[PDB]
Amino acid sequence: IQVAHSSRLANLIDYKLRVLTQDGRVYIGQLMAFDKHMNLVLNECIEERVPKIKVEKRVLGLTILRGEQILSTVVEDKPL
Amino acid sequence: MVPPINCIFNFLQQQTPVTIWLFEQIGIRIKGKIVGFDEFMNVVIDEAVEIPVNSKGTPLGKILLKGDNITLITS
Amino acid sequence: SQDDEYVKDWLYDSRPLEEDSKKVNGTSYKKWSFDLPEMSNLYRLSTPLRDEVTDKNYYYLFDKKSFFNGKALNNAIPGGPKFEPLYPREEEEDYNEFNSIDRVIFRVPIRSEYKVAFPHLYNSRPRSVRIPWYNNPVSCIIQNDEEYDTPALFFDPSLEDFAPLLAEEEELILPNTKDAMSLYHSPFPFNRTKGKMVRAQDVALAKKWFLQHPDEEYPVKVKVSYQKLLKNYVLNELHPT
Amino acid sequence: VSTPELKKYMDKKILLNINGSRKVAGILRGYDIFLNVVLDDAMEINNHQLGLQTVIRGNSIISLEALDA
Amino acid sequence: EHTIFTQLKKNIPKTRYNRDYMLSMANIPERIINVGVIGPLHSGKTSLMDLLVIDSHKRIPDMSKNVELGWKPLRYLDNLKQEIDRGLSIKLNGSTLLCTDLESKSRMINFLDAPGHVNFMDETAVALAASDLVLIVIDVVEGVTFVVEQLIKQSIKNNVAMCFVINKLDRLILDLKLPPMDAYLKLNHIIANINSFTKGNVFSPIDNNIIFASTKLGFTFTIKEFVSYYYAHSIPSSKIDDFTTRLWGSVYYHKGNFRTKPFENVEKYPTFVEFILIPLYKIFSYALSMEKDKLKNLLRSNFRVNLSQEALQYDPQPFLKHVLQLIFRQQTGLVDAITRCYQPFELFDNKTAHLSIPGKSTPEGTLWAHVLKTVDYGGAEWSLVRIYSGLLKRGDTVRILDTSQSESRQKRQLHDIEDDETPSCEVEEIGLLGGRYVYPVHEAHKGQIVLIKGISSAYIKSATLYSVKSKEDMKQLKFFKPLDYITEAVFKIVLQPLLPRELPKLLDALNKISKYYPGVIIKVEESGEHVILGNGELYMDCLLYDLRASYAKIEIKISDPLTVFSESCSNESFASIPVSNISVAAEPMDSKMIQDLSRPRKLSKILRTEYGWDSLASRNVWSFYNLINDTLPDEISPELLSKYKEQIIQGFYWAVKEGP
Amino acid sequence: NGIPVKLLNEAQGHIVSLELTTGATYRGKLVESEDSMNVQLRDVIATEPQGAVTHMDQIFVRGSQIKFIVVPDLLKNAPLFK
RNA sequence: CAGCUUUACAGAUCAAUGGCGGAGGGAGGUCAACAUCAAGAACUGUGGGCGCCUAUAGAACUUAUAACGAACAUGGUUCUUGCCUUUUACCAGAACCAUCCGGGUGUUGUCUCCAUAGAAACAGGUAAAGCUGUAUUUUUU
Numbered sequence A: 001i002q003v004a005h006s007s008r009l010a011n012l013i014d015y016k017l018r019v020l021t022q023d024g025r026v027y028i029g030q031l032m033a034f035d036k037h038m039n040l041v042l043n044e045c046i047e048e049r050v051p052k053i054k055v056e057k058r059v060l061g062l063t064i065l066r067g068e069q070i071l072s073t074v075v076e077d078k079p080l
Numbered sequence B: 001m002v003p004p005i006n007c008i009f010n011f012l013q014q015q016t017p018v019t020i021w022l023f024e025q026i027g028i029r030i031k032g033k034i035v036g037f038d039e040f041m042n043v044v045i046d047e048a049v050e051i052p053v054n055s056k057g058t059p060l061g062k063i064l065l066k067g068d069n070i071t072l073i074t075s
Numbered sequence C: 001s002q003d004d005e006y007v008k009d010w011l012y013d014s015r016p017l018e019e020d021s022k023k024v025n026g027t028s029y030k031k032w033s034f035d036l037p038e039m040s041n042l043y044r045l046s047t048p049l050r051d052e053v054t055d056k057n058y059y060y061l062f063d064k065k066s067f068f069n070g071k072a073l074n075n076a077i078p079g080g081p082k083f084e085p086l087y088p089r090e091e092e093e094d095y096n097e098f099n100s101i102d103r104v105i106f107r108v109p110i111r112s113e114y115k116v117a118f119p120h121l122y123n124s125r126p127r128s129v130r131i132p133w134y135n136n137p138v139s140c141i142i143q144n145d146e147e148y149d150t151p152a153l154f155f156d157p158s159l160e161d162f163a164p165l166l167a168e169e170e171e172l173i174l175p176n177t178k179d180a181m182s183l184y185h186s187p188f189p190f191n192r193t194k195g196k197m198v199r200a201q202d203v204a205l206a207k208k209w210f211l212q213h214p215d216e217e218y219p220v221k222v223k224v225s226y227q228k229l230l231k232n233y234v235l236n237e238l239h240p241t
Numbered sequence D: 001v002s003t004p005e006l007k008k009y010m011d012k013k014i015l016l017n018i019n020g021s022r023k024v025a026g027i028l029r030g031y032d033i034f035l036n037v038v039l040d041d042a043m044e045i046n047n048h049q050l051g052l053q054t055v056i057r058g059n060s061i062i063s064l065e066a067l068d069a
Numbered sequence E: 001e002h003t004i005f006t007q008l009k010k011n012i013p014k015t016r017y018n019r020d021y022m023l024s025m026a027n028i029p030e031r032i033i034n035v036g037v038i039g040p041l042h043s044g045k046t047s048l049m050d051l052l053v054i055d056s057h058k059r060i061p062d063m064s065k066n067v068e069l070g071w072k073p074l075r076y077l078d079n080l081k082q083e084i085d086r087g088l089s090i091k092l093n094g095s096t097l098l099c100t101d102l103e104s105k106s107r108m109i110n111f112l113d114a115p116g117h118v119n120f121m122d123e124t125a126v127a128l129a130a131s132d133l134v135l136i137v138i139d140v141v142e143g144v145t146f147v148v149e150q151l152i153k154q155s156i157k158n159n160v161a162m163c164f165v166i167n168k169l170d171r172l173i174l175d176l177k178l179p180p181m182d183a184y185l186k187l188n189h190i191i192a193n194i195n196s197f198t199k200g201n202v203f204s205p206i207d208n209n210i211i212f213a214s215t216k217l218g219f220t221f222t223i224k225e226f227v228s229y230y231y232a233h234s235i236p237s238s239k240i241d242d243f244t245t246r247l248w249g250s251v252y253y254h255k256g257n258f259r260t261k262p263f264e265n266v267e268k269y270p271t272f273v274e275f276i277l278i279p280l281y282k283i284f285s286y287a288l289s290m291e292k293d294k295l296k297n298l299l300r301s302n303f304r305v306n307l308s309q310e311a312l313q314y315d316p317q318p319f320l321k322h323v324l325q326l327i328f329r330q331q332t333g334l335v336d337a338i339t340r341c342y343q344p345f346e347l348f349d350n351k352t353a354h355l356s357i358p359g360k361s362t363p364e365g366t367l368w369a370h371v372l373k374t375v376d377y378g379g380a381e382w383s384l385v386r387i388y389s390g391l392l393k394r395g396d397t398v399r400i401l402d403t404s405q406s407e408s409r410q411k412r413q414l415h416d417i418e419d420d421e422t423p424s425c426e427v428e429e430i431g432l433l434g435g436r437y438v439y440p441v442h443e444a445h446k447g448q449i450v451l452i453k454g455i456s457s458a459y460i461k462s463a464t465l466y467s468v469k470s471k472e473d474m475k476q477l478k479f480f481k482p483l484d485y486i487t488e489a490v491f492k493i494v495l496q497p498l499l500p501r502e503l504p505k506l507l508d509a510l511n512k513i514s515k516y517y518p519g520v521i522i523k524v525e526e527s528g529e530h531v532i533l534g535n536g537e538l539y540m541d542c543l544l545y546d547l548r549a550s551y552a553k554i555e556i557k558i559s560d561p562l563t564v565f566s567e568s569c570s571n572e573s574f575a576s577i578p579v580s581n582i583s584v585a586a587e588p589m590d591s592k593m594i595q596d597l598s599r600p601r602k603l604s605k606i607l608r609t610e611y612g613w614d615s616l617a618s619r620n621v622w623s624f625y626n627l628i629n630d631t632l633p634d635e636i637s638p639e640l641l642s643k644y645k646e647q648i649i650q651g652f653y654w655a656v657k658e659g660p
Numbered sequence F: 001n002g003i004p005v006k007l008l009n010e011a012q013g014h015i016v017s018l019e020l021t022t023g024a025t026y027r028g029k030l031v032e033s034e035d036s037m038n039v040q041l042r043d044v045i046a047t048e049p050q051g052a053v054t055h056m057d058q059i060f061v062r063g064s065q066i067k068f069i070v071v072p073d074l075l076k077n078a079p080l081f082k
Numbered sequence G: 001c002a003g004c005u006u007u008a009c010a011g012a013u014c015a016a017u018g019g020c021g022g023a024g025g026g027a028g029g030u031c032a033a034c035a036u037c038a039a040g041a042a043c044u045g046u047g048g049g050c051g052c053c054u055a056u057a058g059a060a061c062u063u064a065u066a067a068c069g070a071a072c073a074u075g076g077u078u079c080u081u082g083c084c085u086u087u088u089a090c091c092a093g094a095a096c097c098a099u100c101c102g103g104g105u106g107u108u109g110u111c112u113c114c115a116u117a118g119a120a121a122c123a124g125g126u127a128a129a130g131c132u133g134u135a136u137u138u139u140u141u
């Protein structure tokens, strides 16, 4: 995985982002929009859930992820 | 319309039997009479009694139950 | 120096505005852009010639369109011009049951004023008749006694560490603003403050007067002349070369 | 800032889904900006009733499904 | 080619929002607003519409340089040669615009810029019928004329959200040169007048129903919008609504951090004047007058807006307009206001009921749509239809009923309470009336207006089209009543063609006129003389022009403008005179009663009693139309010959139509 | 103001999906939202973590207990973004 | 008084990546040459789908009481008129047409008058300009 040395979250808009959540699920998708309270809009979102063995996958689409439930956000890939 | 604050006030005025349910805790309940009122749901409640839920009674004195951990009010 | 402060230096020069300035394109003298006060001064100066009615509704049945309609219908608006009729008056009704004096009623006299106003209605068999305008009224009051924002001619109605926007302005109406306002409502020549240059030939200072309704208590000859001028104008307008 | 628009649900029986997989029932009487419900008391989910009139706190509410359409 | 015009091809003005999104939105109801903008003559509704269109779109071909600059108005929706050349909006040529609110989210809006002039009030009526909200635009100067009042009344009658637009502030700012305080006072007065004419709902600039517009200079604003733009930086989020509320109603600032209802001695003017009107005035004066650099600096500072280097060299009025645009951003405030006004969608049902009858809702069972007005939008006939429920697909086989055959149908239904499909048509092509272009679409969904091509030929004026799949469904259905074109027509122009040879052509033209101009009765009399009963002079003239140029191109004779007279009686009938190969009396009704009429037997009787305090027997006997018909002899209650009098009453109708 | 909130508001009308902290997914016509994500829906299904579906008419949901909201792909196209 | 983006700055290792790059004028002439300015409200290409749709885009000028002119002449042709009786020279209207006096826009080319730099961002400072900010139930206590 490769990515530019970014300064802020707003500066890396429309990059393919992995997003970890408190329940255990991993939402991968392109960051369309952000919030003051870390709510993320994701372009072509895919939920990856790991039950207690192997990654179970679910395609979503346009999604509004709330900030409360997010643990952290990793850059999966660049735009396009 | 009857607001929650108004209801609380009414209850206070009455001094009738009240049964409070605790937040994030199913097995335990409280039963007393509302004495106090605050800007939040926090209220002081004399003659309180702890109750284990039927999935009877236990000894308990005078208490102020904090607003954050309330679930139910009734009076 | 007091009234005509800005214009005096250049007004009477061969090239009306100097070469090598920011007010005209340059020595080619093809375009001009003016500041406000100079423009205002010019307007003030031109009071004799530019004497135009700022009210657009004034020209009711003195429109080019109206004139054209009149010409078509062989119907003189009494003030305005008259022409040879487009169509020869083929008086061949033959006493038919339509438009008879047995049939119709004469409460209204159906003046030829009304013909050019609703051509397609009041006139029967209209031909090559253009459509006229049908307008709003112009409440526009200009102060002649050197005063600022006053309800003069009309009547009154019956009944956190910050300030409003444009605070520290200290004055609603700037000293030049009355003039600006006046300019605003005035017609084409002065309305603007930038333009392409027309030839001295291509300016018309007489035109405006003859377009207007003639000033009353003039002699017959003058009226006739005015009419002639109008006719000349109208014909030119009509046939676009 | 904005009031919860529950004027459609006024004087209707609502299944209030609350914290810890619990449930409450009753007709809706009132509300406020914090989503503290005021409702006439009914049974807790076989089934058994407590109280006459009840006032539920906002934080505890998971959902409130309308029984009456 | 054509002289009376539309776009005629798919090089349409491209739009800042994408049209696909709009189409999608139109699928779902609750996210469609039929606005139908209305007012008096030259209030500037059309100007407003044009502005809106401009805001929506990228680069429009019709909009020249001059119009762009500001100079000439882009009168967009008066696309007809006549409506151009004449200066009047004459026909309903509205728009379908995805318009955003203060809440960034966006909704599709079927505007309809009606005529202002009082002889095309049929058009206005049609618009009202179509539209669920109605923007009542008013000339600030002219104020609330009688016309405005009438419009308001009409709106009230046919249940609609009245979101006002007080238009032409420029006139008071600059033309009149009213002081800011004076202007404010004037505005207040206008508002008061509006309120008075209205029954109950109190309109003010707070609550976002009044909208302050100057559509030549190119800005509309509700105070809320203004606040959002320019009193967010200073004032925190808690008290913004509060601040807005404070602004208008005779409160002051007190040179101090909180406002006070009393008058204060140090400061002069109210909050509205201080926080809005004064600012506007300043903007105006500076634009006209101030040194340009200074103005630019101010803009940079206060409004946070930059003038382009090109825009500095502009001419005065244009410059001013530009400045206004920069300040008052692309008109979303108006949209927001509209939305606020039409946040109740419970009115919709009421409106529907008014249109037709107290209805039992049956959405899934069938599609139905009020065909409102026929139109010659793009030369070819379209039909302006509001799909009320269901979805109207392209190439669908659809039953239609002209409102002529509505009452009869209803009666039949009642009586009933076999498949009798009387006429029907196929939908050729559906399109959105987008001012000068018809953007074409395949579907057409509930609560939106559209142009449909196939319908026109069935009906004459105002149809109801529907596509049922059952007997029960049919029973459930109702049929829109004929549009009460508020202005009744009494301007009688008689025709004859000058060449009898082309009488068919003339007839065709007449038919077309009837279809298009709804406020047009066309009596074909016995003498071979066609008669047009138009609304007024100007309207009549327009109609003639349309006929004698566009829908015929024929030499046509025309009478002096007469009126429809109507026979009556002053005193009561004295002689009891029968007729043979019946004896009926005559007496005038009560003036008040007549007026009431102009604006179940027991119930009827009661009503009569309430009205005139007549005898009960008379009431019982009564059964009227168009006026009054009783059956009050002695032996009729015993007799069965006089009983069953519907047929008899039919005869009377003829008499009423054609008097002595 | 919150752009996700705005998006949600825009989605009003559409068949949105909606999961909670409890993990109980809903899918239906969005009716109304607020600054805090106080959603309402119509004609809505309700599936638990187990998988057993349960249909229901009118549901209101509180933003705190909401996990994430799936909007249809149409609102990706336009127009509140830019 | 925080944050990021740009200039004005040293001395850098200078990779990394961007952006200003085959980096080199500006103002104008009563100076040219060409193009083009009345048409389905009307523009031009580009591929793709196959003379037409769908995306790309571009677009200087002129236009709605419709025009390059907020300006107005003269011809020619027919037809009708008028003074008239021969014609020119005329009257005044119509329909086509032309001529002319002008106008833009764009592209070059020139003529004149003023002028002259071939490389700067990164770690972050110093200074100044653009926007955002001011723990008790729904986000982060």
Ligand SMILES: Nc1nc2c(ncn2[C@@H]2O[C@H](COP(=O)(O)OP(=O)(O)OP(=O)(O)O)[C@@H](O)[C@H]2O)c(=O)[nH]1
Binding pocket: C136, E040, E041, E042, E043, E044, E045, E046, E047, E048, E073, E075, E087, E088, E089, E090, E114, E115, E116, E117, E167, E168, E169, E170, E171, E213, E214, E215, E216, E217
């Ligand atoms: N002073 C001023 N004039 C305006 C304003 N808006 C429009 N006008 C002018 O006044 C007239 C009104 O504009 P229109 O759009 O033609 O009026 P309208 O709404 O079409 O009126 P209808 O033809 O009856 O529909 C036009 O001549 C405009 O130039 C305004 O805000 N201020």
